[PDB]
Amino acid sequence: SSQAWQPGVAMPNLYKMQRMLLEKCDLQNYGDSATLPKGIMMNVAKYTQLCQYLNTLTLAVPYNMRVIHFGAGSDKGVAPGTAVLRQWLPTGTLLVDSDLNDFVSDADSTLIGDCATVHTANKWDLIISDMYDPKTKNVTKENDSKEGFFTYICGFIQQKLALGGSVAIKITEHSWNADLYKLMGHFAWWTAFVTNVNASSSEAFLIGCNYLGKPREQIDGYVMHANYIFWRNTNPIQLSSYSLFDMSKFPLKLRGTAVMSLKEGQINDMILSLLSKGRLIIRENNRVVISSDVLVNNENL
Amino acid sequence: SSQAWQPGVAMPNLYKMQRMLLEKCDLQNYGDSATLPKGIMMNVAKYTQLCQYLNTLTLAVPYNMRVIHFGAGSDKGVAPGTAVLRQWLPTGTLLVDSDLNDFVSDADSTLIGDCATVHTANKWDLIISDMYDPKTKNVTKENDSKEGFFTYICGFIQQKLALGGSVAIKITEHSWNADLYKLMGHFAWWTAFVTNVNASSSEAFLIGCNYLGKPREQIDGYVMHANYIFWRNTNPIQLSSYSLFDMSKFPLKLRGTAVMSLKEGQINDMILSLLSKGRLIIRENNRVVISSDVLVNNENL
Amino acid sequence: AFAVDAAKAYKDYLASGGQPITNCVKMLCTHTGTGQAITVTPEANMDQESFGGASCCLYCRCHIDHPNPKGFCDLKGKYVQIPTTCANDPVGFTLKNTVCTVCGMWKGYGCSCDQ
Amino acid sequence: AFAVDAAKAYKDYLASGGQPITNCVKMLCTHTGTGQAITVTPEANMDQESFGGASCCLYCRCHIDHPNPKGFCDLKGKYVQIPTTCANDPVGFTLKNTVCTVCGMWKGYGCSCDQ
Numbered sequence: 001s002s003q004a005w006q007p008g009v010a011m012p013n014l015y016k017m018q019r020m021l022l023e024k025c026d027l028q029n030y031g032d033s034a035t036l037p038k039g040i041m042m043n044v045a046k047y048t049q050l051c052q053y054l055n056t057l058t059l060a061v062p063y064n065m066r067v068i069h070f071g072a073g074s075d076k077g078v079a080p081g082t083a084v085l086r087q088w089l090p091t092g093t094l095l096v097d098s099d100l101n102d103f104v105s106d107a108d109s110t111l112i113g114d115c116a117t118v119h120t121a122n123k124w125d126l127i128i129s130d131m132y133d134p135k136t137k138n139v140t141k142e143n144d145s146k147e148g149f150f151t152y153i154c155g156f157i158q159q160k161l162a163l164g165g166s167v168a169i170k171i172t173e174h175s176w177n178a179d180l181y182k183l184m185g186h187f188a189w190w191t192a193f194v195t196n197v198n199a200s201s202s203e204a205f206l207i208g209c210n211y212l213g214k215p216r217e218q219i220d221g222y223v224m225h226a227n228y229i230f231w232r233n234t235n236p237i238q239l240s241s242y243s244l245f246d247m248s249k250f251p252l253k254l255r256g257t258a259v260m261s262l263k264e265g266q267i268n269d270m271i272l273s274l275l276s277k278g279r280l281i282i283r284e285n286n287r288v289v290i291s292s293d294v295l296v297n298n299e300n301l
Numbered sequence: 302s303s304q305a306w307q308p309g310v311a312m313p314n315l316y317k318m319q320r321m322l323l324e325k326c327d328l329q330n331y332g333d334s335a336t337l338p339k340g341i342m343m344n345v346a347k348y349t350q351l352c353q354y355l356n357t358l359t360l361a362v363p364y365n366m367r368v369i370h371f372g373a374g375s376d377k378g379v380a381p382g383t384a385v386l387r388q389w390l391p392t393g394t395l396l397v398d399s400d401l402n403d404f405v406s407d408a409d410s411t412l413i414g415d416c417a418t419v420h421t422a423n424k425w426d427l428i429i430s431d432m433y434d435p436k437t438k439n440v441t442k443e444n445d446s447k448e449g450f451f452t453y454i455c456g457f458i459q460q461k462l463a464l465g466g467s468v469a470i471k472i473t474e475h476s477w478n479a480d481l482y483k484l485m486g487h488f489a490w491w492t493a494f495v496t497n498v499n500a501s502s503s504e505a506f507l508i509g510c511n512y513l514g515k516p517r518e519q520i521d522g523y524v525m526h527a528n529y530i531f532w533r534n535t536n537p538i539q540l541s542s543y544s545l546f547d548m549s550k551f552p553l554k555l556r557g558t559a560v561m562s563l564k565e566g567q568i569n570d571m572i573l574s575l576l577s578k579g580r581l582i583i584r585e586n587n588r589v590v591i592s593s594d595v596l597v598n599n600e601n602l
Numbered sequence: 603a604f605a606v607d608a609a610k611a612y613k614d615y616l617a618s619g620g621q622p623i624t625n626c627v628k629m630l631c632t633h634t635g636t637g638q639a640i641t642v643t644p645e646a647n648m649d650q651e652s653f654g655g656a657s658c659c660l661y662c663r664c665h666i667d668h669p670n671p672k673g674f675c676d677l678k679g680k681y682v683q684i685p686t687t688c689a690n691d692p693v694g695f696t697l698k699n700t701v702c703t704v705c706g707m708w709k710g711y712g713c714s715c716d717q
Numbered sequence: 718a719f720a721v722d723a724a725k726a727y728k729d730y731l732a733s734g735g736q737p738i739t740n741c742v743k744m745l746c747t748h749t750g751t752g753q754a755i756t757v758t759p760e761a762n763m764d765q766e767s768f769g770g771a772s773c774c775l776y777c778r779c780h781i782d783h784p785n786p787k788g789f790c791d792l793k794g795k796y797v798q799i800p801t802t803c804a805n806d807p808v809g810f811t812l813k814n815t816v817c818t819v820c821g822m823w824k825g826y827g828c829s830c831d832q
């Protein structure tokens with residue numbers, strides 16, 4: 001019952017090993033809301049608990065860390081999640097965020113537009129995504145794997161995530177993608193994490209911990225999402241904001257993780273072992289350059 | 302003496318054929334100023350006369366023409382040259398402009414930053430540059446070929462100018478580049494054009510007319526700039542704004558020039574002939590996408 | 603509920619004797635054009651000057667959001683005709699005046715749909 | 718010579734009874750911090766709340782230029798500590814108040830360099 005004092009609940013390994021069929025998600029406490037500290041927004045609490053959970057994993061934390069945050073704008077025009085990420089990350093961490101619509105942000109750089117227009121030369125140590133289209137909550141149509149921004153995110157991970165880096169990608173009952181689950185098997189470890197403040201929602205964060213760039217295990221993504229919903233359907237999680245009141249150990253510890261530039265041929269088992277333990281990042285260490293594509297057209301006459 | 306009613310004076314062919322040594326530029330009417338129509342800015346008059354001269358050449362003018370304009374901002378924060386270009390170009394012409402510093406523009410899209418950060422997927426039918434660093438007017442040091450933005454411009458022309466397209470690149474006595482002159486020999490025709498309103502200045506526009514993508518003639522750029530200064534030094538041009546008062550034939554005529562997608566192997570002599578006459582443009586006809594690189598960094602602690 | 607009112611600010615600044623915004627981009631043209639207010643190409647008649655639209659837009663010139671919910675600009679990328687008697691303040695003129703949706707002339711400076 | 722005065726506009730809007738700008742991003746923190754005004758990480762003490770800086774900047778929130786000649790932001794990318802009694806209006810507070818360049822506390826809300 002100790003779960004209420006945790007930041008959230010991670011999908012237990014035994015549920016990952018099942019072979020369930022996809023069912024409708026029916027949460028016992030749907031509609032309930034946790035009691036947030038006075039004046040604290042849901043999205044601040046949510047990202048705080050996500051970062052508190054990430055503190056328990058073997059994240060690589062190099063000097064001059066690079067973090068990109070997709071889906072960072074709110075309907076309020078500000079960026080609560082980015083502000084929590086920057087509080088959490090070591091001072092000086094390069095933080096880039098993006099969203100479809102304009103918003104004001106504490107990130108070092110913000111790109112506005114569809115995520116597909118975002119291009120970057122360099123690789124990243126941590127990718128956070130809260131991208132979500134609430135139109136997907138259409139209960140009257142079948143629940144199939146979704147494309148759209150999930151297609152971008154899978155490509156971005158394979159092309160622009162440093163070996164050893166990590167990801168947390170928001171999903172829901174209907175907002176999910178089979179390839180993204182498959183890609184979780186290319187990390188040393190993975191889970192689906194539910195924040196205690198949002199436990200009445202089918203939302204979870206799919207976390208890939210320490211990227212290996214190749215399949216470590218084969219995961220069928222349609223089956224894994226069915227496994228995730230089965231877990232949610234049979235394990236009510238008690239709403240809780242307890243962990244928000246103790247922030248003394250919140251900051252991500254600067255581990256000074258080593259960065260090395262290496263080529264395909266030189267990634268042996270010793271390296272792979274170091275990657276798996278959060279002790280190594282592999283990517284160039286050049287300067288960070290980003291851009292967004294702009295479509296040009298003249299609508300006169 | 303008829304030159305006063307022209308928009309300007311183009312470098313006569315015989316001067317292009319010389320082999321002069323580079324001298325200091327000494328203009329008889331240095332410091333004089335032409336009398337502009339009431340309330341008309343120098344840069345509006347300058348670009349108007351440049352466009353009036355371009356009306357006399359065999360410019361390719363396709364449907365959905367694409368024009369990019371570098372160095373488009375003024376110290377007033379607006380874009381006079383872009384406004385003249387848009388008046389001149391057919392309605393609906395895609396116009397992109399750029400400058401180092403912020404400015405408000407009538408272009409369909411504006412990119413702010415060093416021109417080296419500008420990237421485009423597609424090819425262009427016309428490239429205009431007014432980029433200029435007044436620091437180059439240092440008379441106490443030797444006058445060598447300059448790099449900086451001229452290096453970018455030469456690469457941009459070779460990589461992003463459609464076959465059949467044209468350019469006008471501002472130069473001065475000290476702001477010039479030998480490779481750019483060499484590149485003039487890759488067009489069916491070229492000149493250096495001096496506007497009558499700015500004839501007291503060593504400024505000229507280097508115009509390449511109908512791009513062929515290969516050397517048609519070999520041009521030594523150090524010698525050609527010396528030839529240009531020799532012409533300027535020995536041919537005083539009378540300041541004049543006469544051509545500004547007759548705008549009835551100003552609009553660039555929409556020739557509907559044909560656009561074709563072709564590969565290296567298929568550019569025979571018949572095609573080359575069509576290119577040379579302003580009757581053909583060769584490039585993809587996809588949509589126009591541009592972007593500027595953004596350097597990211599976190600200056601905290 | 604707070605929003606800057608730049609339109610009112612400029613109006614009050616002009617009332618108090620402030621100098622109108624300068625460096626609006628005046629175009630060369632025939633001055634034999636239709637005289638309509640906002641056009642794709644300069645259309646000044648004998649009694650008008652034509653300016654590049656962006657440089658006569660208060661929102662463009664001040665680097666502030668446009669009052670449209672979509673933030674679209676009436677003037678950017680077009681040309682605005684200003685009565686010659688009013689051309690000392692093109693930003694003021696476009697701000698204060700309104701275009702007839704029927705004939706395209708400035709209401710009270712070319713619009714004659716009222717007879 | 719014309720420039721919008723957003724600072725004065727907001728001050729006058731507040732005087733006339735307008736509701737302060739909302740949705741400033743309040744952070745979770747220990748509230749055992751140094752209490753300095755603007756910091757790289759939340760530093761609220763027992764009598765302060767910490768907010769994400771960009772969301773408390775009038776210029777950031779209004780999409781207008783910053784009063785610096787370089788257009789740089791004091792608050793973007795940092796955290797601002799606001800007295801709890803004043804946290805209903807963080808934009809107002811940061812606008813109206815000034816940080817001591819010696820100790821880094823808010824003048825009149827933590828600065829004691831005057832004894």
Ligand SMILES: CC(=O)NCCCC[C@H](N)C(=O)N1C[C@H](O)C[C@](C)(O)[C@@H](n2cnc3c2c(=O)n(C)c(=O)n3C)C1
Pocket residue numbers: 025026027028029030031139173200201202
């Ligand atoms: C004691 C007493 O009077 N209680 C009666 C009132 C309960 C009200 C509450 N809204 C509820 O539990 N319901 C009632 C439905 O009939 C069953 C349904 C549809 O499966 C429920 N539900 C579960 N998880 C859900 C959903 C759901 O719609 N959606 C959209 C989800 O995303 N999730 C995750 C919704």
Ligand SMILES: CC(=O)NCCCC[C@H](N)C(=O)N1C[C@H](O)C[C@](C)(O)[C@@H](n2cnc3c2c(=O)n(C)c(=O)n3C)C1
Pocket residue numbers: 326327328329330331332440474501502503
């Ligand atoms: C009858 C009477 O009293 N007139 C005497 C006053 C004349 C004043 C006028 N400024 C002038 O002609 N001068 C005087 C210099 O001594 C000779 C010099 C330097 O070569 C001249 N000059 C020519 N082209 C020039 C320049 C020049 O500097 N620069 C920087 C150029 O870029 N160009 C293109 C400049």
Ligand SMILES: C[S@@+](CC[C@H](N)C(=O)[O-])C[C@H]1O[C@@H](n2cnc3c(N)ncnc32)[C@H](O)[C@@H]1O
Pocket residue numbers: 043071072073074075079080081082098099100101113114115116130131132133148149
């Ligand atoms: C749940 S909100 C995230 C809010 C933000 N993370 C916060 O801290 O409050 C989801 C966001 O994803 C964005 N989004 C959805 N689809 C997108 C796409 N294809 N490209 C870029 N952004 C997208 C939406 O604009 C929306 O603001």
Ligand SMILES: C[S@@+](CC[C@H](N)C(=O)[O-])C[C@H]1O[C@@H](n2cnc3c(N)ncnc32)[C@H](O)[C@@H]1O
Pocket residue numbers: 344372373374375376380381382383399400401402414415416417431432433434449450
């Ligand atoms: C002579 S002004 C051009 C003014 C503009 N064409 C007009 O119509 O008024 C030259 C411009 O070139 C720009 N420039 C110089 N070097 C540049 C560079 N390396 N990259 C981009 N712009 C540059 C300057 O900012 C300057 O505004």
Ligand code: NA
Pocket residue numbers: 134136137172173174175
């Ligand atoms: Na959903």
Ligand code: NA
Pocket residue numbers: 059060061125126164165166
């Ligand atoms: Na990491």
Ligand code: NA
Pocket residue numbers: 435437438473474475476
């Ligand atoms: Na010069």
Ligand code: NA
Pocket residue numbers: 360361362426427465466467
């Ligand atoms: Na052309």
Ligand SMILES: [Zn+2]
Pocket residue numbers: 656659660661662663668675676677678
């Ligand atoms: Zn505008």
Ligand SMILES: [Zn+2]
Pocket residue numbers: 702703704705706707713714715
């Ligand atoms: Zn009318």
Ligand SMILES: [Zn+2]
Pocket residue numbers: 771774775776777778783790791792793
């Ligand atoms: Zn700001």
Ligand SMILES: [Zn+2]
Pocket residue numbers: 817818819820821822828829830
């Ligand atoms: Zn002090």
